[PDB]
Design a protein around this ligand. Structure first.
Ligand SMILES: N[C@@H](Cc1cc(I)c(Oc2cc(I)c(O)c(I)c2)c(I)c1)C(=O)O
Ligand SMILES: N[C@@H](Cc1cc(I)c(Oc2cc(I)c(O)c(I)c2)c(I)c1)C(=O)O
Ligand SMILES: N[C@@H](Cc1cc(I)c(Oc2cc(I)c(O)c(I)c2)c(I)c1)C(=O)O
Ligand SMILES: N[C@@H](Cc1cc(I)c(Oc2cc(I)c(O)c(I)c2)c(I)c1)C(=O)O
Length: 568
């Protein structure tokens, strides 16, 4: 009779408190740390009263009613601001969801010895700081995976803080934020899929992906798994985080009890601890594909029953087409497989209302150009990457995309282009047959970042079109954009280049980011400059910066010499 009691008992007090803190920090990203912990503790102690008697006052209230009521107990609007706390459920929860900010304007690592002192001072307060700061900067983070990150975070300190601490803690902390931002972007795509294109689009994506990983499983087994996984991500993406974690744990138990009807690669994943086992299953490699599978053309092109099966049970028949095609093509990206199933459905739509056997007899010819376009694209960029290396590969992609959509803001163009260029590092080391799913599905994740970053403040009609027209065609849409000829050159400002004392002591990574910022501004100012012309200007300006960083009075040099180039 009490839902808060049910989840407190299923998850245990430690994971309960952590998940409630994550939930509050994702809904109110600007609220100070001390105010959230205070609300968390009141919630936890009420939950204990309900475990002791599920008929006590208020113990019958929904989780949304209880969490929303707490958040409503604690500046300038410029005339525009939604008032979520004046709404009733379920409208109030929808209002909270609509104010999640993907780009929180919030500040961006103290000394190694300084952290170690705060750790042993209070471990528990130190770990909650880690959850709070990540959750408020990534408001769609997959909440059960964040628990697994917090445990690896706790283990790095419980080892390195106790000969040298810097050479022990800093490499580990560095892979925790790489692997942290990869995980965040990956889940932002699932949530955008469910919220903008609907449940039916998500389930197709999951049929395709689970059929590749589990090609020996029966179609009925894949469909059960997809139904359970869709419920989990629906919950995590609508802020039902206690339910999401409880159902994720239940799904892992089901998979591990039924290994022999699912995959032979699960042996070791299923012997690991609670959070580690779900994380293991999520990244398991594909199983071996059965030999001598019958031809696809036999059931889907040649059978005289094609139009009958499409009419009598359309969702099952089209789901079977996708399952059968995907299990025998681990070498295709998920979005390519979804494009083929859409083409097949359109064709039967047309042909079954006409000699249909003759109408759709040549449907496989339509698939060949869909397969060839991404194969050639990724063959070319890998050639370029191997020649140029990551930094200059990034700069090649940055000039291309700035010229496609020059209205997009400079920070967003730099961040997206850097991430697009990481695809060569990540995927070009694989042999041919392994490259398409690695590269084209990573590119979907980065292009979705461009879409959600731009949606907050739309300025480019072309970005809006490609992001709203069709989820699976996003990458071909962007690849096809030419240079905008209607863009008026941006005029010089100069505030971009004002001296700051930190520019003469940059790390290598932050040097690249400064140079990439200046290249975007240059293309926006001179959209017709050739490649040789851009290089000559770039190389002269970098030499100016190196000159004045060696001066007796740095600021004087920057001010005196910078003005000459401005009036040149
Ligand atoms: N490269 C893709 C492939 C992939 C997607 C899903 I969707 C999936 O099914 C699960 C099951 C559980 I349990 C999870 O916690 C999650 I997250 C996904 C599995 I196996 C693999 C990816 O991993 O996204
Ligand atoms: N030297 C090549 C020209 C070429 C330039 C770029 I820059 C490039 O990289 C991308 C990456 C993405 I993602 C795109 O959507 C696009 I369009 C281009 C590729 I591949 C090829 C030739 O002449 O064959
Ligand atoms: N105004 C900013 C600091 C800032 C100063 C300069 I001078 C600059 O311009 C370049 C151009 C090239 I080409 C380089 O290789 C480098 I390093 C810096 C940039 I971008 C940023 C602030 O207040 O923080
Ligand atoms: N005297 C010109 C103004 C002008 C100043 C600069 I300094 C400049 O050089 C750069 C180099 C980089 I690198 C940039 O990102 C940018 I924006 C401009 C250029 I070309 C033109 C006029 O009044 O028309």
């Amino acid at each position: 009779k009490s839902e808060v009691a049910h989840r407190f008992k299923d998850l245990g007090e430690e994971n309960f408190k952590a998940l409630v803190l994550i939930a509050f920090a994702q809904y109110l990203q600007q609220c100070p740390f001390e105010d959230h912990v205070k609300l968390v503790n009141e919630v936890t102690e009420f939950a204990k009263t309900c475990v002791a008697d599920e008929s006590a006052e208020n113990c019958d209230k929904s989780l949304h009613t209880l969490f929303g009521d707490k958040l409503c107990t604690v500046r300038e609007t410029y005339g525009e601001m939604a008032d979520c706390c004046a709404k009733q459920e379920p409208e109030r929860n929808e209002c909270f969801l609509q104010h999640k900010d993907d780009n929180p304007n919030l500040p961006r690592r103290p000394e190694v010895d300084v952290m170690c002192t705060a750790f042993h001072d209070n471990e528990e307060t130190f770990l909650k700081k880690y959850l709070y700061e990540i959750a408020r900067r990534h408001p769609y983070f997959y909440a059960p995976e964040l628990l697994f990150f917090a445990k690896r975070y706790k283990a790095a300190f419980t080892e390195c803080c106790q000969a040298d601490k810097a050479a022990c803690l800093l490499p580990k902390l560095d892979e925790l934020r790489d692997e942290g931002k990869a995980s965040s972007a990956k889940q932002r795509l699932k949530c955008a899929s469910l919220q903008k294109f609907g449940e039916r689009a998500f389930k197709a994506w999951a049929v395709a992906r689970l059929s590749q990983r589990f090609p020996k499983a029966e179609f009925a087994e894949v469909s059960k798994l997809v139904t359970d996984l869709t419920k989990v991500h629906t919950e995590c993406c609508h802020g039902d985080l206690l339910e999401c974690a409880d159902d994720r744990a239940d799904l892992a138990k089901y998979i591990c009890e039924n290994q022999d009807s699912i995959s032979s690669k699960l042996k070791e994943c299923c012997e690991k601890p609670l959070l580690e086992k779900s994380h293991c299953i999520a990244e398991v490699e594909n199983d071996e594909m059965p030999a001598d599978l019958p031809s696809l053309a036999a059931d889907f092109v040649e059978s005289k029953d094609v139009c009958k099966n499409y009419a009598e049970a359309k969702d099952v028949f089209l789901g079977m087409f996708l399952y059968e095609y995907a299990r025998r093509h681990p070498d295709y990206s998920v979005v390519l497989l979804l494009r083929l199933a859409k083409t097949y459905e359109t064709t039967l739509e047309k042909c079954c209302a006409a000699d249909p056997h003759e109408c759709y007899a040549k449907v496989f010819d339509e698939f060949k150009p869909l397969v060839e376009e991404p194969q050639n694209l990724i063959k070319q960029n890998c050639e370029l990457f191997e020649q140029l290396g990551e930094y200059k590969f990034q700069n090649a992609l940055l000039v291309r995309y700035t010229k496609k959509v020059p209205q997009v803001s400079t920070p967003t163009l730099v961040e997206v282009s850097r991430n697009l260029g990481k695809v060569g590092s990540k995927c070009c080391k694989h042999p041919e047959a392994k490259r398409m799913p690695c590269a084209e599905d990573y590119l979907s994740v980065v292009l979705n970042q461009l879409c959600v970053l731009h949606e907050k403040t739309p300025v480019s009609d072309r970005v809006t079109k490609c992001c709203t027209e069709s989820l699976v065609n996003r990458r071909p849409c962007f690849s096809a954009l030419e240079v905008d000829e209607t863009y008026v050159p941006k005029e010089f400002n100069a505030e971009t280049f004002t001296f700051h004392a930190d520019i003469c002591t940059l790390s290598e990574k932050e040097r690249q980011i400064k140079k990439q910022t200046a290249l975007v501004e240059l293309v926006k100012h001179k959209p017709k400059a050739t490649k040789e012309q851009l290089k000559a200007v770039m190389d002269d300006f970098a030499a100016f910066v190196e000159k004045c960083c060696k001066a007796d009075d740095k600021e004087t040099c920057f001010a005196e010499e910078g003005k000459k180039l401005v009036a040149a």
